[PDB]
Design a protein around this ligand. Structure first.
Ligand SMILES: [Cl-]
Ligand SMILES: [Cl-]
Ligand SMILES: [Cl-]
Ligand SMILES: [Cl-]
Ligand SMILES: [Cl-]
Ligand SMILES: [Cl-]
Ligand SMILES: [Cl-]
Ligand code: NA
Length: 129
């Protein structure tokens, strides 16, 4: 599913992401825009043989099992295909583990390079939340 900006903001708010570990909702929308272009089906293969899955491009080396990433962990305890669902619940629950891990949202390279230190409130402007 390809989400609208406000539709996704509302879904993330209902799943408890607004101010989760201090990150306002605009941060999560900005990250999703630049990671996946708001497309739950996005996949991208990395040089190391790991793959990034879904709206928040969660990586198979640490967070999910795709059956093809040797010596990988599955810290979210989910098949990576669960992250491509139109229901963002599995992605959100896994993102909460990731952002609690010590690096905060710096774990998302697109957030660090394209969202961090920008006016992220702009991503939820105009939305009925
Ligand atoms: Cl947009
Ligand atoms: Cl915000
Ligand atoms: Cl694997
Ligand atoms: Cl594991
Ligand atoms: Cl699994
Ligand atoms: Cl959803
Ligand atoms: Cl933090
Ligand atoms: Na894995």
């Amino acid at each position: 599913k390809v989400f609208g900006r406000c539709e996704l903001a509302a879904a993330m708010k209902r799943h408890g992401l607004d101010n989760y570990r201090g990150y306002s909702l605009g941060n999560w929308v900005c990250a999703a825009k630049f990671e996946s272009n708001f497309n739950t089906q996005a996949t991208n293969r990395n040089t190391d043989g790991s793959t990034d899955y879904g709206i928040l491009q969660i990586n198979s080396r640490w967070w999910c099992n795709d059956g093809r990433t040797p010596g990988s962990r599955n810290l979210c305890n989910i098949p990576c295909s669960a992250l491509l669902s139109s229901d963002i619940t599995a992605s959100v629950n896994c993102a909460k583990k990731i952002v609690s891990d010590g690096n905060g949202m710096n774990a998302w390279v697109a957030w660090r390079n394209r969202c961090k230190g920008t006016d992220v409130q702009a991503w939820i402007r105009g939305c009925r939340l």
